Structure 1
C-alpha cells in the first residue's frame, strides 16, 4: 500500500524538472520559473498523496499487464501528480480565502513573509501545470482530450462547490437555517467527492481505454457515495477523533462549518437546544466550543455516526455489487477499505 507512496514521491523530482526546464531555454523568464519551482516544492509535497496514488493503483488494476511498459507507467505517475497539483491549487487558494494559518503542519504558503496575496497567482500556476504535464506526456494518446476535459470539469465542480460552501457558511455570521441536510450533501458532492474520488479513478479509466459514458456514470455513482461518507467521517473525526491518530485538533465549530455534526444536531435539537447552538456555534472561546460539543454528546451524535457508518458501508457494498461490472471490484474495494478502516 505505502511502498507505492515512496515510489510516487520519488517521481516528483522529474515532474519539477520538466516543468521548470525553461530556466535556461528562455533566460528572461528564469526568475519566474525559479519562483514556480519554489511554489511546486512547497505546496505539492507534504500531503498523504491519496488522490494521486489512486490514479496509479487503479491504472495498474485496469490495464492489461503487457500494455504496462515504462512509458505507460510514467504517464500514470504523471497523471497522479496532476491530481495532486489540482489538490495543491485548491488548498493554496482555500487557505487564503479562509485566512488559515497552517496546512500539513507548516505555515500556509500565503502566510510566508514575502508571499501574501501573490499566492493567488501561485495557485493559478499550479493549476496551469496540470495542462502543461498533460500535454508533455499525453498529447499523442487517444485519451488526451478526455483527460483535459476531466480535469477542467473537476475544477469547475470543485469551484462551484466552494461557492456553495462560502454562501452557506460565511465566517463570522451564524445562520443555522442554512445548514440543512440537502445543502450539506450538495456541498460535499461538488466541493470534495468529485475531485477526490471520481477524478482519479475516471482518469485511470480513460488511460486504460475505458471511455464509455455508461461505465463512467456507474463508477461515478459508487464513488460520489463513497466521497459523501469520507467527508462525513472527516467531520465526525474533526471533533471526536484521537489527535495522535488524525493529526487534526478540530476547529469546525469555531469556524461556523456546515459539518455533518451540526446538521445532525439541528435535526434533533429541541428549541432550547437550537438556542445553545445559536449562542455558541461559530465562536472562538473554549468554554463556548465545550458547550456545543457537550450538546453533541447529549444528543448521542457518536452513536448516530457509528450507526450511520454501518448503514453506509452496507450500501456501498451493494453499490459495488450492482455497478462495478465490468470493472474489477477491487478498484472500488481498495477505496472502501481505506475509508471504512
Structure 2
C-alpha cells in the first residue's frame, strides 16, 4: 500500500523541516526564544495524526512524475509540500480548537488548553501558517510551480476560513436553530471547510509539482476531488455516531455539540412536525438520556440505510467522475485515494 510504505520517509523528513525552520535563530539569537517556542508548537501540533493529507501530496507526486524525474531533491521538495499541508491543517485545528472550546484533539489535550498557552495559541496558529510559506520559499523558490503552490495554499486557507465562517453562522455557540441546517447549506460548509484543503489541495499541489498547471486539468481534478470530499465528511458524521469506536478511534460527539452533521440534515429532511419536535428538545444536550433519544430517532428514520444507499450511489458516481475527468492524469491518482475513503 503506497501510503503505508511512504509514511516512514515522510515522518523522518519532519526532523529536517524543524531544523530548517529554527535556522534563522542562528543568525539572529535575539529571537531564539520565540523560535524555541516555534519548535514546541510544530513538535506538538504537526505531529501525532495519520498524516493522510500530507502523504497524498507524496503518493500523487510519485504517480504523476517519471521515476527518472523523481531525483533526491524532487522528493525532498515533495515531502516538504506534504508537510505544508499538515502545517495548513495544524493551523486550522489549533484555531478551531480554541474557537469551539474543544478539550482534546487526537486524544491529547488541545494546545490552547496546555497550562501557560491559552489564547497565546492564536499567535501559535498563525506561526504554523507562516511556516507553510517559509518552507515553500526554502525548498521551492527556484521551481516554476513556486507561485502556483503559494497561491494554492493561500486560496485553500481562504476557502477553509470562508467554510469556517459559514459553519460558525450555521450552528452558533449558544443558539439552537435546526431551520438553517439544510442539505444545500451542509454541502457548502463541507466544500469550503473540509473538501478544498483535504482533497483538492494535496493532489493539486502534486499536479503543480509535476508541471501539470493547466486550468482545465485542475478543474477536472477539482470536479472529482470535491465530490470525494463531500463523501468523506458525510462518512465522518456517520462514523461519529453509528461507527464502532475501536476501528475509528473516536466517540460520538456531534449530537451534544449541536453540529451540522449529515444525520441531522437527513432527519430534518425526512420528519413529521412531531418527529422534528423531539429532536428540537434532545439535540445539543450533555445528558446521555437525550443523546440516546436522538440516536433512536435516526434509527427509526432508517438513516443508517439512507447512508448505505448514499455510499453505494457515491462510489458509483465517483467512478463515473474518474472515467470522465481523470484524463490525461493517470486514474490511479484518484483511485488510490478513493480506495482509502470508501470502506
The equivalent residue for 2:311 is: 309
User: Shift in Å at residue 283 of structure 1?
Assistant: 1.2
How much does 1:25 deviate?
A: 1.5
Using the TM superposition, give the Cα deviation of residue 264 of structure 1 relative to its aligned residue in structure 2, in angstroms: 0.2
Shift of 1:307: 0.5
Find the aligned partners of 1:302 and 1:317 in 2 and give their Cα distance: 23
Per-residue deviation, 1:96: 0.2
Q: Distance in 2 between matches of 1:13 and 1:74?
A: 12
| 1:93/1:123 contact within 8 Å kept | yes
Residue in structure 2 matched with residue 322 of structure 1 by the alignment: 324
- Deviation (angstroms), 1:44: 0.1
> Does the Cα contact within 8 Å between 1:171 and 1:282 map onto a contact in 2?
no
Distance, in Å, in 2 between the alignment partners of 1:314 and 1:327 is 20
Answer with 153-162 or 166-175: which moved more: 166-175
* Comparing 59-68 and 231-240, the one that deviates more: 59-68
- Superposed CA deviations along residues 76-100 of structure 1, whole A, max 9, x for unmatched, are 0000000000000000000000000
**Paired residues of 1:85 and 1:126 also in contact (CA < 8 A):** yes
Separation of aligned partners in 2, 1:95 and 1:197: 21
Once the 2 structures are TM-superposed, how far is the Cα of residue 282 of structure 1 from its aligned partner?
Answer: 1.0
TM-score by length of 1: 0.99
Q: Return the offset for 1:225.
A: 0.2
The aligned length equals: 341
RMSD (Å), alpha carbons: 0.6
Q: Indicate which of 172, 181, 184 corresponds to 1:182.
A: 184
Q: How far apart, CA to CA, are the structure 1 residues paired with 2:40 and 2:308?
A: 43
1:131 positional shift: 0.2
Is the partner of 1:202 in helix, strand or coil? helix
Deviation sequence 1:167-196 (CA, Å, 0-9, x none): 001133110001000000000000000000
Taking the aligned partners of 2:284 and 2:172, their CA distance within structure 1 comes to 10
**Paired position in structure 1 for 2:66:** 64
- What SS does the aligned partner of 1:179 have? coil
Misfit runs of 4+, over 4 Å:
none
Q: Answer yes or no: is the 8 Å Cα contact 1:232–1:260 preserved in 2.
A: yes
Deviation at 1:200, TM superposition (A): 0.4
| Aligned mates of 1:287, 1:173 — CA distance in 2 | 21
After TM superposition, give the deviation of residue 320 of structure 1 in Å: 0.2
State TM-score, norm by structure 2: 0.99
1:233 pairs with 221, 232, 235, which one? 235
Equivalent positions of 1:270-285 (< 5 A) are: 270-285=272-287
Counterpart-to-counterpart distance in 2, 1:27 and 1:211: 40
Could you report, residue by residue, the CA deviation over 1:195-243 in whole angstroms, capped at 9, with x for unpaired residues? 0000000000000000000000000000000000000000000000110
List alignment gaps of at least 5 residues for structure 1: none
